[PDB]
Coordinates of C-alpha atoms in Angstrom, one line a residue:
Chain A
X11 CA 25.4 -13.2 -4.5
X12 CA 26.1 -10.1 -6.7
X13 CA 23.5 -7.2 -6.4
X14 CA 22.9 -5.8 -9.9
X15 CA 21.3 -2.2 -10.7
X16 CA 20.3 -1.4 -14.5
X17 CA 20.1 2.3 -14.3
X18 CA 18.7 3.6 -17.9
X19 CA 18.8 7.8 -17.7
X20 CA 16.9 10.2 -20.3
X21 CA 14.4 8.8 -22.5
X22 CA 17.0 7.0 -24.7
X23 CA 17.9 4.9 -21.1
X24 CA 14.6 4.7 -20.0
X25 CA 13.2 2.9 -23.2
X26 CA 16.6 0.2 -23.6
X27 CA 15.5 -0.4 -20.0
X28 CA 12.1 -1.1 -21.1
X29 CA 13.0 -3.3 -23.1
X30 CA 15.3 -4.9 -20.7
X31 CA 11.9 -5.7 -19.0
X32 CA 9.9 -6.2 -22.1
X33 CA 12.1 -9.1 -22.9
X34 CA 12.9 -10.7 -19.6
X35 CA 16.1 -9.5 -18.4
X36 CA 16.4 -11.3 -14.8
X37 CA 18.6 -11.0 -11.6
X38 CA 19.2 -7.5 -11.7
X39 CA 17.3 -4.4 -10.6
X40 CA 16.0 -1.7 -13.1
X41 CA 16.0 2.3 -12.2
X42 CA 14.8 4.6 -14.8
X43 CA 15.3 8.3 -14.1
X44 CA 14.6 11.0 -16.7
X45 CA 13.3 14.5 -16.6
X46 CA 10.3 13.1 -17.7
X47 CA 7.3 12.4 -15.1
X48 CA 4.9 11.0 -17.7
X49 CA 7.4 8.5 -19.5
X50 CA 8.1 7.3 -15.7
X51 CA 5.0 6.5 -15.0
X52 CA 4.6 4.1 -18.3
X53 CA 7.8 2.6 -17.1
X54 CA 7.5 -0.7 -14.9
X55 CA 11.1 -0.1 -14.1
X56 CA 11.7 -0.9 -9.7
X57 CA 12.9 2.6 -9.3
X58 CA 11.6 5.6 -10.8
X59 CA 12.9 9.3 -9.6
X60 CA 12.0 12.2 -11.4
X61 CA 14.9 14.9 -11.2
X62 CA 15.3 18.0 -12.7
X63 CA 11.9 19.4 -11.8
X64 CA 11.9 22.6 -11.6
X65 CA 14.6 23.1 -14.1
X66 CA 12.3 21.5 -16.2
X72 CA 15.2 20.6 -25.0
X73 CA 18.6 18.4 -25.5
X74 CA 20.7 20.4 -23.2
X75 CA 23.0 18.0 -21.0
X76 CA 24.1 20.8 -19.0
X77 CA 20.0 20.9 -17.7
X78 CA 20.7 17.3 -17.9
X79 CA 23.9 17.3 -16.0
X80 CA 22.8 19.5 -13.2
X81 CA 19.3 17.7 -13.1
X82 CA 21.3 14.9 -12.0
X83 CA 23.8 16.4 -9.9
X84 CA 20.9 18.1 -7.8
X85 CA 19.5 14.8 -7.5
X86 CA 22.9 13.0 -5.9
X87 CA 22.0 12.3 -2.7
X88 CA 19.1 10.7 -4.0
X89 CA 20.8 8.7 -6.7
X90 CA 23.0 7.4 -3.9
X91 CA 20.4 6.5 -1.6
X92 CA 19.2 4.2 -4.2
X93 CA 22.7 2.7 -5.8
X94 CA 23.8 1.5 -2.2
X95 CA 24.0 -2.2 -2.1
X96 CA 24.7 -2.5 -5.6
X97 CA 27.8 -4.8 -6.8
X98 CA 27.5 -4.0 -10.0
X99 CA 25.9 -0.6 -11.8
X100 CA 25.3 -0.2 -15.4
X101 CA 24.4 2.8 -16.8
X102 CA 22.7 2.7 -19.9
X103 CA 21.4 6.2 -22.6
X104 CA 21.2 7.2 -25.8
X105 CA 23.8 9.6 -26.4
X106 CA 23.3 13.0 -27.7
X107 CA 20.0 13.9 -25.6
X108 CA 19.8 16.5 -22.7
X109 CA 18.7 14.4 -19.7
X110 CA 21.3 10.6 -20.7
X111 CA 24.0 12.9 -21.7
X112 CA 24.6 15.2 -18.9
X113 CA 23.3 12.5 -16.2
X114 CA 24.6 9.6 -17.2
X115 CA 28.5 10.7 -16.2
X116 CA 27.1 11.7 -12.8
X117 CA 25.1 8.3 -11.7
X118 CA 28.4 6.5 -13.2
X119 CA 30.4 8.8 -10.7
X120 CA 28.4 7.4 -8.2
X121 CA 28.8 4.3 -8.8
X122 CA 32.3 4.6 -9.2
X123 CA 32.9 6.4 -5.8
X124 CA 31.2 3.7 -3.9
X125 CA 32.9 1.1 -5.7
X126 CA 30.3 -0.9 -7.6
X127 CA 31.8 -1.5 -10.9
X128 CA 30.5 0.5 -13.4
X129 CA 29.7 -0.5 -16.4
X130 CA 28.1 2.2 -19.0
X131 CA 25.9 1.2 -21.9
X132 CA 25.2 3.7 -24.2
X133 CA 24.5 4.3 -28.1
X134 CA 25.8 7.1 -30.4
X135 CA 23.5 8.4 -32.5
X136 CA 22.6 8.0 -35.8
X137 CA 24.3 10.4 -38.1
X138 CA 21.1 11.5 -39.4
X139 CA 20.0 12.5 -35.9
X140 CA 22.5 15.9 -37.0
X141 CA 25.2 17.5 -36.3
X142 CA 24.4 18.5 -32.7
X143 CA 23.6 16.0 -31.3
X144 CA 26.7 13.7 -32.4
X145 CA 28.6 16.9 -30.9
X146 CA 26.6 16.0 -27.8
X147 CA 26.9 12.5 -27.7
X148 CA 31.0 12.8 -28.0
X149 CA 31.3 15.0 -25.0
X150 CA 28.7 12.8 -22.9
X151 CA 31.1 9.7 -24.1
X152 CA 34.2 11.1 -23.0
X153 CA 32.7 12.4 -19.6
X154 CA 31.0 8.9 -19.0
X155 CA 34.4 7.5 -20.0
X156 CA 35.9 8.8 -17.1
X157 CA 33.4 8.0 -14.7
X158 CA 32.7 4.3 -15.9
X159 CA 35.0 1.8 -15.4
X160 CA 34.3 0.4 -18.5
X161 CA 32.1 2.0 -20.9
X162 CA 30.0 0.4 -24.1
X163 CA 29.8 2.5 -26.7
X164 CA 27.3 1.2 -29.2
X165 CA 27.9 3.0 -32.9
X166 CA 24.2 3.4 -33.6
X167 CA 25.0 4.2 -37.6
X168 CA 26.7 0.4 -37.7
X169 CA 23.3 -1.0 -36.5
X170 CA 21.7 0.0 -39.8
X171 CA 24.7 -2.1 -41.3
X172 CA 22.9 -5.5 -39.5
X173 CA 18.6 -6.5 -40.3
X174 CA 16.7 -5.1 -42.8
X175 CA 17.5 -2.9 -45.9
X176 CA 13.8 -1.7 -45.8
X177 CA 13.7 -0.4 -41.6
X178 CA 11.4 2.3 -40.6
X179 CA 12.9 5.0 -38.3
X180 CA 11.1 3.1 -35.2
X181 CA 12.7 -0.2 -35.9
X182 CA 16.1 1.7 -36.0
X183 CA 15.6 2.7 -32.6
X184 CA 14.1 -0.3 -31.3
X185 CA 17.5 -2.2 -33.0
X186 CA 19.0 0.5 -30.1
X187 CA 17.5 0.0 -27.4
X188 CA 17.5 -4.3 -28.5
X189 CA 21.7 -3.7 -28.9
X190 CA 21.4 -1.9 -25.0
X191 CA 19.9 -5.0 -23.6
X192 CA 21.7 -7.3 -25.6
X193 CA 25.4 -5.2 -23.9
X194 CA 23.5 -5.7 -20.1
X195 CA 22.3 -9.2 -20.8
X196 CA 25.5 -10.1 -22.4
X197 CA 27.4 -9.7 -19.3
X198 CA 24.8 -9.8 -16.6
X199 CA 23.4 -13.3 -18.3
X200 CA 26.5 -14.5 -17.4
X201 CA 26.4 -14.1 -13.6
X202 CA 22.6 -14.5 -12.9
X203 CA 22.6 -17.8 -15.2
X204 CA 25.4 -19.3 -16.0
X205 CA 25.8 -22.2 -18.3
X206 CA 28.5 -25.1 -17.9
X207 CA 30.8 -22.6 -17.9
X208 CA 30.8 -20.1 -14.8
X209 CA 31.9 -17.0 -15.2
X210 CA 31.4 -15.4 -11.8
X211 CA 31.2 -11.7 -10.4
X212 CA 34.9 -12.0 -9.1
X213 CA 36.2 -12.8 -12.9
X214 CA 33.8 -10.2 -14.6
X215 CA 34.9 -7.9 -12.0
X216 CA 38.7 -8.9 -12.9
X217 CA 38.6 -7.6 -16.8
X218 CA 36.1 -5.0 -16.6
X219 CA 37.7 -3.2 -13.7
X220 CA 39.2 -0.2 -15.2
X221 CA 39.2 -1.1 -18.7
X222 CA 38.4 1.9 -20.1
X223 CA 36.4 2.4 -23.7
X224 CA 34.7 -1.1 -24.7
X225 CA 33.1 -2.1 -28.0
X226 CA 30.4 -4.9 -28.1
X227 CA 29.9 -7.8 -30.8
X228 CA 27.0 -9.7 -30.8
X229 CA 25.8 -12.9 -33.5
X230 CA 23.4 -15.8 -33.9
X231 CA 23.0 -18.9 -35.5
X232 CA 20.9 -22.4 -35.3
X233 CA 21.5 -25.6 -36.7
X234 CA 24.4 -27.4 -37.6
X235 CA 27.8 -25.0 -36.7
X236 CA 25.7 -22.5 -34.7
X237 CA 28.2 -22.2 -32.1
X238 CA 30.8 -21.3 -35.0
X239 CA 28.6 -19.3 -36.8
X240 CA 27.3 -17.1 -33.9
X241 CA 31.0 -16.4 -32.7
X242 CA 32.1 -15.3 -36.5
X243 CA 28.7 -13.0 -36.9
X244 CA 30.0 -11.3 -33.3
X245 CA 33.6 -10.8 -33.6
X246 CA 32.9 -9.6 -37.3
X247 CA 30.4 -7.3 -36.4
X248 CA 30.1 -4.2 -37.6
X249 CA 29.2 -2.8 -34.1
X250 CA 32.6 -3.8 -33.1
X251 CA 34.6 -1.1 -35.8
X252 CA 37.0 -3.9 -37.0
X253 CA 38.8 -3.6 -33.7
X254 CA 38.2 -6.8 -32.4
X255 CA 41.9 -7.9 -33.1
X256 CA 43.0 -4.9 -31.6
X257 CA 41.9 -5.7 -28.1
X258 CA 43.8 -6.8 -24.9
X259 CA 40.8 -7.6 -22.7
X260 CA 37.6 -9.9 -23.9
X261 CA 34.7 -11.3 -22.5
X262 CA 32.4 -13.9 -24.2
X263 CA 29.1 -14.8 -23.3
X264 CA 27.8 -18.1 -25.3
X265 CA 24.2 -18.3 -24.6
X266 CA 21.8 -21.8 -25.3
X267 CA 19.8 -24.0 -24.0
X268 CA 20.3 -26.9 -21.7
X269 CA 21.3 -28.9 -24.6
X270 CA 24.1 -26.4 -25.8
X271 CA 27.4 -29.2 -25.1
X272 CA 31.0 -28.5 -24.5
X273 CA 32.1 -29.3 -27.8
X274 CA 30.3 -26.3 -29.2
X275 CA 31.2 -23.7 -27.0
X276 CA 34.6 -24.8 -27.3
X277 CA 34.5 -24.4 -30.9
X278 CA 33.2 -20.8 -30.2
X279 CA 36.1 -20.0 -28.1
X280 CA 38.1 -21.6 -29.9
X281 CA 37.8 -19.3 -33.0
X282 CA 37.7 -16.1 -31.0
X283 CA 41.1 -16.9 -29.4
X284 CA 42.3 -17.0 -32.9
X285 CA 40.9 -14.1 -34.3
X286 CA 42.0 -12.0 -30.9
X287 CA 45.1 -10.2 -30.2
X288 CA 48.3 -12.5 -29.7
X289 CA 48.4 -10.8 -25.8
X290 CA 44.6 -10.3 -25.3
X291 CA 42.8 -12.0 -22.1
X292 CA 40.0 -13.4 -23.2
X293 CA 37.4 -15.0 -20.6
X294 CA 34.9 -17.2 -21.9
X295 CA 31.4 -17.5 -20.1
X296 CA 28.2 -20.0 -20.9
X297 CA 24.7 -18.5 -20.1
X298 CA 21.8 -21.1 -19.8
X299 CA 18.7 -19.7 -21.3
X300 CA 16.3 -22.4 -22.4
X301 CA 14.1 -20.1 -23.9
X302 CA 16.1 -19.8 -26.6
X303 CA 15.3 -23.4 -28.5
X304 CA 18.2 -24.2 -30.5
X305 CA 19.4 -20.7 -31.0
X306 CA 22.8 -20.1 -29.8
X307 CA 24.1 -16.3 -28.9
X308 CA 27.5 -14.8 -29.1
X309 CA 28.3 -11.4 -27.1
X310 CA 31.9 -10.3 -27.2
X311 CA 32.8 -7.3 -25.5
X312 CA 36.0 -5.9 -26.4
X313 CA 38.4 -3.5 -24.3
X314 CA 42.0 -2.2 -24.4
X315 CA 43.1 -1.1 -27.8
Chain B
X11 CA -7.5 -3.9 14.3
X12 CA -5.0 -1.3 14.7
X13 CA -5.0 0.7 12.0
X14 CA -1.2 1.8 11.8
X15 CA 0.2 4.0 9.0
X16 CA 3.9 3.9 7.7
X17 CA 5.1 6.9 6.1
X18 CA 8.3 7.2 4.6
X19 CA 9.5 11.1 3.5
X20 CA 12.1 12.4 1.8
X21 CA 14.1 9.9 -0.7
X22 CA 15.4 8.0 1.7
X23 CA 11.9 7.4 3.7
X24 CA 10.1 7.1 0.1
X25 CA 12.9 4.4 -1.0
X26 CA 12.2 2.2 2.7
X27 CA 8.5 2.5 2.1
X28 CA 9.3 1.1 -1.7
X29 CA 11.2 -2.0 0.0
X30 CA 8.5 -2.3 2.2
X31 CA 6.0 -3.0 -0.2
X32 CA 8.3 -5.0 -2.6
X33 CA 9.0 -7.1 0.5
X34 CA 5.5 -7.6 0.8
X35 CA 5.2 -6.1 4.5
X36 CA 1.4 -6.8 5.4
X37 CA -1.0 -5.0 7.5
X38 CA -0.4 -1.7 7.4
X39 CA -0.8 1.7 5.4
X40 CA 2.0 2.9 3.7
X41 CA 2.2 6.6 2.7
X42 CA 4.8 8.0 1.1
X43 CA 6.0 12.0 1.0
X44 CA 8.3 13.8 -1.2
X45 CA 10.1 16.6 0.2
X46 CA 11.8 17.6 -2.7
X47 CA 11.1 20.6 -5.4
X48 CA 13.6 19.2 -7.9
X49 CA 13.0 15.6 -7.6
X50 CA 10.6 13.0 -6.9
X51 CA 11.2 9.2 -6.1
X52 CA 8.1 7.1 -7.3
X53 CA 6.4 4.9 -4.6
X54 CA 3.4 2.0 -5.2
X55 CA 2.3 3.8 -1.6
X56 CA -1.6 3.8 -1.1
X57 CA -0.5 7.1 -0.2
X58 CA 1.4 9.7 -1.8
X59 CA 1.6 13.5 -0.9
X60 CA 4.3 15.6 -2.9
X61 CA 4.7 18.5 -0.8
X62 CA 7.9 19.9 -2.3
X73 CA 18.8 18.9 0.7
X74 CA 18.2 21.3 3.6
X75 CA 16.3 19.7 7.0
X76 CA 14.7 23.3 6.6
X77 CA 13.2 23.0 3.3
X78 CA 11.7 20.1 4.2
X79 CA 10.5 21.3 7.2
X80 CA 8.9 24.2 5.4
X81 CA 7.6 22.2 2.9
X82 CA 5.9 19.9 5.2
X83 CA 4.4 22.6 7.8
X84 CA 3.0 24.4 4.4
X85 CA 1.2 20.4 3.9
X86 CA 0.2 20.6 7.6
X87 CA -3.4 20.2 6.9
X88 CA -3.2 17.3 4.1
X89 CA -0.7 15.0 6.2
X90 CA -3.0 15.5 9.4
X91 CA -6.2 14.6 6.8
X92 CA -3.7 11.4 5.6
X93 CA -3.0 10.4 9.7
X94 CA -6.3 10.9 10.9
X95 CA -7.9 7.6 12.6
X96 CA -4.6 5.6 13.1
X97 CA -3.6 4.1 15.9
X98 CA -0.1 4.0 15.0
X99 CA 2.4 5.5 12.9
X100 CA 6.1 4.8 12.3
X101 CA 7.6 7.7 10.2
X102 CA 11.4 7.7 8.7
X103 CA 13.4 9.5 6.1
X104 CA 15.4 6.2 5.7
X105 CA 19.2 6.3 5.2
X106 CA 20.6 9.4 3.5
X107 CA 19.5 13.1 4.9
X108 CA 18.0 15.5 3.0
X109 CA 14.8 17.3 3.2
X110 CA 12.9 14.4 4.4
X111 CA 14.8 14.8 8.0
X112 CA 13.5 18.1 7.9
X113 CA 10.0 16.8 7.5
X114 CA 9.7 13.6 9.8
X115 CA 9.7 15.9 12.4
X116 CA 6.6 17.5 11.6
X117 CA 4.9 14.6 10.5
X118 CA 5.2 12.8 13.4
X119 CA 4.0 16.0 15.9
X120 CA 1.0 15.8 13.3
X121 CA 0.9 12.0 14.0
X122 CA 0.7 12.6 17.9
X123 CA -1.7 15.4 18.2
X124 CA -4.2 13.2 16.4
X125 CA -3.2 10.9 19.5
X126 CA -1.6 7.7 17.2
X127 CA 0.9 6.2 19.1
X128 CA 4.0 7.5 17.0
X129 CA 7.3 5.2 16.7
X130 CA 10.3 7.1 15.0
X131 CA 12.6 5.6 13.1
X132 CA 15.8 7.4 12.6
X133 CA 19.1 5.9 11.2
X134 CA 22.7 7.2 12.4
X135 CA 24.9 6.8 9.3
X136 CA 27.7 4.7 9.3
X137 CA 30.9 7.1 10.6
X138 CA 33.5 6.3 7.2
X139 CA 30.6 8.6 5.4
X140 CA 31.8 12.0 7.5
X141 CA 29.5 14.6 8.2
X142 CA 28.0 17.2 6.6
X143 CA 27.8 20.7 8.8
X144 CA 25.5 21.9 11.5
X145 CA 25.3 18.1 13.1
X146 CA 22.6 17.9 11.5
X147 CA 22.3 14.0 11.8
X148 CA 21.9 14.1 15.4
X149 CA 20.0 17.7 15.2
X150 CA 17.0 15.4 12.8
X151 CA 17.3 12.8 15.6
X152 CA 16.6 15.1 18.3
X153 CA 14.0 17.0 16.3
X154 CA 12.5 13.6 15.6
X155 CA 12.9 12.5 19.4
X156 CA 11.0 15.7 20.5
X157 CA 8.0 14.4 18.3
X158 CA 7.6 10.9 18.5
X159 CA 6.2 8.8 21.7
X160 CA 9.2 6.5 20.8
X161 CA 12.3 7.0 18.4
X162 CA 14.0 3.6 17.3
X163 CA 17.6 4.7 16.6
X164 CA 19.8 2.4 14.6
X165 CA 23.9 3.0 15.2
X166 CA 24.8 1.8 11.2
X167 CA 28.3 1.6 13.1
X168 CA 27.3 -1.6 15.1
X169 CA 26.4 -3.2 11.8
X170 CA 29.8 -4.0 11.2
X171 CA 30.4 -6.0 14.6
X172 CA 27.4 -8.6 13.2
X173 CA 28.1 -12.1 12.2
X177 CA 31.7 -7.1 6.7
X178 CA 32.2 -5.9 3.1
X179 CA 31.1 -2.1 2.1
X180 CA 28.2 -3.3 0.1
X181 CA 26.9 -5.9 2.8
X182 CA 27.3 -2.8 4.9
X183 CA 25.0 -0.6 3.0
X184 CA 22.4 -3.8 2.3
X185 CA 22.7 -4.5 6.1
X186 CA 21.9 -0.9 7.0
X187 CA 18.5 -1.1 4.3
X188 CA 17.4 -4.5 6.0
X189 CA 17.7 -3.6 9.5
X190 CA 15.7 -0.4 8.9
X191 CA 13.0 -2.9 7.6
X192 CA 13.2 -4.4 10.5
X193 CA 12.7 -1.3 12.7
X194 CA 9.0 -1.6 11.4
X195 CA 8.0 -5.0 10.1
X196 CA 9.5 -7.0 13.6
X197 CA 6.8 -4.5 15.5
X198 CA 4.1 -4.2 13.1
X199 CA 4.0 -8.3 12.7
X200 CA 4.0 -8.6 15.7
X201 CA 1.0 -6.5 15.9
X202 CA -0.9 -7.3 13.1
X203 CA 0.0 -11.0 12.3
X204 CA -1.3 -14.1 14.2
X205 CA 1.3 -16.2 15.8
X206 CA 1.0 -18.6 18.7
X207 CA 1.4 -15.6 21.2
X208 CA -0.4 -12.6 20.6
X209 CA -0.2 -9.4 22.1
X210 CA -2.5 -6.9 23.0
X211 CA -2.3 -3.3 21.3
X212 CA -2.7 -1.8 24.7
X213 CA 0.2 -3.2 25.9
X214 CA 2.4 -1.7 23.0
X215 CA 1.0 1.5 23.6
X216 CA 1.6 1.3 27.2
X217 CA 5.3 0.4 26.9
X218 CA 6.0 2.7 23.6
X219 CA 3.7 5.8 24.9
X220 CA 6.6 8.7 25.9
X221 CA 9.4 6.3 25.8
X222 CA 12.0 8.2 24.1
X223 CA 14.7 6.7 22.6
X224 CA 14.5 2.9 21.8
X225 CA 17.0 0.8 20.2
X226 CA 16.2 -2.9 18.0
X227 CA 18.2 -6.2 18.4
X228 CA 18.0 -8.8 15.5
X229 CA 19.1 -13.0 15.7
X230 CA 18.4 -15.3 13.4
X231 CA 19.0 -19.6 13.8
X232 CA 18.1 -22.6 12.9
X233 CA 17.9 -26.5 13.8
X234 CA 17.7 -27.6 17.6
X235 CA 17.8 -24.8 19.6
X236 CA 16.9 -22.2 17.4
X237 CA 14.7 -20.0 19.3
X238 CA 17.0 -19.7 22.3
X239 CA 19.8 -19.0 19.9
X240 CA 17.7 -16.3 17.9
X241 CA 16.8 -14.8 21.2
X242 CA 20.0 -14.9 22.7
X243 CA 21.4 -13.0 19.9
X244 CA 19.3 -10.3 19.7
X245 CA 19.5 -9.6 23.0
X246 CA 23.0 -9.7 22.8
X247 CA 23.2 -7.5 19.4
X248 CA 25.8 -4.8 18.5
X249 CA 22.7 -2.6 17.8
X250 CA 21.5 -2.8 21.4
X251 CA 24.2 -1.2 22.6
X252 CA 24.5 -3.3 25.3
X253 CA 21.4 -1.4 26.7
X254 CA 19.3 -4.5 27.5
X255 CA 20.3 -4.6 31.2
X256 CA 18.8 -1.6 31.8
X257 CA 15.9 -0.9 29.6
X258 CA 12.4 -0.7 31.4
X259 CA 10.3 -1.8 28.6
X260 CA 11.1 -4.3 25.9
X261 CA 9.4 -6.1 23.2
X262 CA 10.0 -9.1 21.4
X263 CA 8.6 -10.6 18.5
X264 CA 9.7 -14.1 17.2
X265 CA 8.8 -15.1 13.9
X266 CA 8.7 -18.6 12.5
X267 CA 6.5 -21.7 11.5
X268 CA 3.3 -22.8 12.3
X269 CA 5.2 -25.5 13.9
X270 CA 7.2 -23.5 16.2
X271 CA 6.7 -25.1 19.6
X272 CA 5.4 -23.6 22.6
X273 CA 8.2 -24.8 24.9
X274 CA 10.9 -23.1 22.2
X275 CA 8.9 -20.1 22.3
X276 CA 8.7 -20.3 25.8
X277 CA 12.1 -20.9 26.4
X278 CA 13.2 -17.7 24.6
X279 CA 10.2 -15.6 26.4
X280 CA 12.2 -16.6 29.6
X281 CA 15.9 -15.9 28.0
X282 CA 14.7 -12.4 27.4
X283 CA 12.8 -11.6 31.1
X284 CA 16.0 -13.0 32.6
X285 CA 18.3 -10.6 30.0
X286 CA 15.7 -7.3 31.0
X287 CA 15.9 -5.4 33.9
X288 CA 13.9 -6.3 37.2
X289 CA 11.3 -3.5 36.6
X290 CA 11.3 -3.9 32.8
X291 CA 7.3 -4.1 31.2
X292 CA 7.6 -7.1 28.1
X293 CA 5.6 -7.5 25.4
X294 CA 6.2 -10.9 23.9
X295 CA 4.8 -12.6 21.0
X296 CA 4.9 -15.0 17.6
X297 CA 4.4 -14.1 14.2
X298 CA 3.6 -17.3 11.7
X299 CA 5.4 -16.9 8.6
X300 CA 5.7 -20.3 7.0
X301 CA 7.7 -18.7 4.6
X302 CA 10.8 -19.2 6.3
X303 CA 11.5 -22.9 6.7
X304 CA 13.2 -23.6 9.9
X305 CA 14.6 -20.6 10.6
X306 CA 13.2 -18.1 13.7
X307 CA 13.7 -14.8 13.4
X308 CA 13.3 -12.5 16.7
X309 CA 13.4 -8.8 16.7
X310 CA 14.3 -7.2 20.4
X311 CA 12.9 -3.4 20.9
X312 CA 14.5 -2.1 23.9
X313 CA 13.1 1.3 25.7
X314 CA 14.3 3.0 28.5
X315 CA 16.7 3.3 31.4
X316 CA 18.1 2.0 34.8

């Protein structure tokens, strides 16, 4: 039995993992820390630590050392854990600078460690896309595989006519939908069971990871879904570049073996001629007859 | 009705308090204290003081809260403090704390982790240093050697979720006992007469099921790696064994008479049930073993 702790860090973190819980994410644990005592408190998050108190504007280095005075603490409360994703919005202060140091935690204890995080939107400016690259290639080396969700390819997918709160609700929706893509898997597996050990096995040391995700209902939903994911724009056109994939195929209890078949089948030919590709089967009955495709792609 | 008080300080203690409560330990008061200026861990406590990774800071900072935590002990009977696993400032604190706690006159139960050796040492000794603070202020400190946890039944995550549940323990196998009806029940006094100026105390935890189960439980605590092999020679001991409704008195009985053979000659026993239906046809017995030959 795999212990699982969601950390989301900085606002960005803290509201994906809100939505995490919002929307029913089960079988894992959810810490929110920010720099923020107020959004903490709105949280229903397990754990909540306020860090960076007295220190406390966008600045990872507050951010970074915010989290790095906090380390013992962090610790104390990733112990135990199997498995640790990390989850921000690039490009902040608080998710930026902390996020690399609760991943190095992780990493030193040897939970794997899976970050989730979103670039920003271009429009967010110049800055902050300077801040979010730095924060991605310092989380890089800390995770041992690390999500990066291009937030300007989300507005690519829904609506033409999106407010600037549903664009950032599609981000913290595409940070649950990276967690529950893979954690899905493990807490409740479908006919096919993809366990810790094998999720463990591909993620380990993968490196930078991209994420596909599609739906469909009805006749070919299985097909469909799969096409929408490895076609999706969040994935960069890269998903025939990659060495290492994971699938999660999500349905009900009437979803058969035929269909998800017919899923993987499509994804092992679109994939690299040399790629490992695991296939995994979530059970979700909540979902009617609505079937869900999450790729994540690694090693280009 | 006792009215004991658990407080939790520092990250680590706040954290224990949190599992506490999310494990739906009954009966008592929880109150939890950060220690910390630049942090604070969150806590559904009844009872929160924020009175802020030196012991000293912490130590400071709760000396400086002196009044408040007194005004937050006053009328209990008991209280267990810990900083959890981890240091920090909250080993700084416990210490003061608990010589609140006993001045009020609650009997005032320690409970202090020793960290598991593979995560070295940080300088001063100040592991053992919070111990012996903690020691010098509490009517009993329950120590728990993380080491022994790998000599029971160990992977480095069961290690660190072993450590977290045994701390739990250290309070809820003494506080049910206390303050949950079982088939046997035991008399406040008689805790307070065994744990009153007792120093250092150590816990034993068995578990079992089917036929036999509550010799078995009780034979394993008694023999646990986190005894020490101090049974033989403590002078007061308590045990607690939790089970069914339909745990028998003969069973019970059987493992009340394992554990008086297993003490010493001159030891004092407290010895009781707890009911928790919850837990099918398993027994669970804590041991708390106190004192010398």
């Amino acid at each position: 039995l795999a212990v699982i702790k969601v950390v989301g860090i900085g606002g960005g973190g803290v509201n994906a993992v809100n939505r995490m819980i919002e929307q029913g994410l089960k079988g894992v644990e959810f810490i929110a820390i920010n720099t923020d005592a107020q959004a903490l408190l709105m949280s229903d998050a397990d754990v909540k630590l306020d860090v960076g108190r007295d220190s406390t504007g966008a600045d990872p280095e507050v951010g970074r050392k915010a989290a790095e005075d906090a380390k013992d603490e962090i610790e104390e409360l990733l112990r135990g854990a199997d498995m640790v994703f990390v989850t921000a919005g690039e490009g902040g202060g608080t998710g930026t600078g902390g996020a690399p140091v609760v991943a190095s935690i992780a990493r030193k204890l040897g939970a794997l460690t899976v970050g989730v995080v979103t670039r920003p939107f271009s429009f967010e400016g110049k800055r902050r896309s300077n801040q979010a690259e730095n924060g991605i290639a310092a989380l890089r080396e800390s995770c041992d595989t690390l999500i990066v969700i291009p937030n300007d390819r989300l507005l690519q997918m829904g609506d033409a006519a999106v407010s600037l709160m549903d664009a950032f609700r599609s981000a913290d929706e595409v940070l649950l939908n990276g967690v529950q893509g893979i954690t899905d898997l493990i807490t409740t597996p479908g006919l096919i069971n993809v366990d810790f050990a094998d999720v463990k096995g591909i993620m380990s040391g993968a490196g930078t990871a991209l994420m596909g995700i599609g739906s469909a209902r009805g006749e070919g939903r299985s097909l469909k879904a799969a096409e929408i994911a490895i076609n999706s724009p969040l994935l960069e056109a890269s998903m025939e570049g990659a060495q290492g994939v994971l699938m999660s195929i999500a349905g009900g209890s009437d979803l058969g073996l035929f269909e998800i078949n017919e899923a993987a089948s499509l994804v092992q030919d679109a994939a690299h001629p040399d790629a490992n590709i695991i296939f995994g089967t979530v059970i979700d009955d909540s979902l009617g007859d609505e079937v869900r495709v999450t790729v994540i792609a690694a090693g280009f």
